[PDB]
Design a protein around this ligand. Sequence first.
Ligand SMILES: [Zn+2]
Ligand SMILES: [Zn+2]
Ligand SMILES: [Zn+2]
Lengths: 54, 28
Amino acid sequence: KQHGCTRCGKNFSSASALQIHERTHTGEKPFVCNICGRAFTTKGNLKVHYMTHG
Amino acid sequence: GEKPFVCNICGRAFTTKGNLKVHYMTHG
DNA sequence: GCTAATATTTCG
DNA sequence: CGAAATATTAGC
Ligand SMILES: [Zn+2]
Ligand SMILES: [Zn+2]
Ligand SMILES: [Zn+2]
């Protein structure tokens, strides 16, 4: 099975990868910085953002 | 250290030989 | 620098 | 295995 974005057309390596990509269309950003409240689509991008505070 | 593989054209560093290789092609 | 997104690697 | 993490990239 290919995990394609039926609603945008891009293909992805896994279902969870499709998940992350779908957030670019829905605006879902489940990872919120506890210091300033900026929201991110991925855990990894929030992690990097925390290093801009310390 | 962290990124031992360095591109002698632009000076960017990379964690693996392979990552350097794919970047090095963009200068060709 | 700092974000948005994804390709590659790692993980349990 | 697919999820998760990580490295990288594009953009400004
Ligand atoms: Zn899409
Ligand atoms: Zn913050
Ligand atoms: Zn270079």
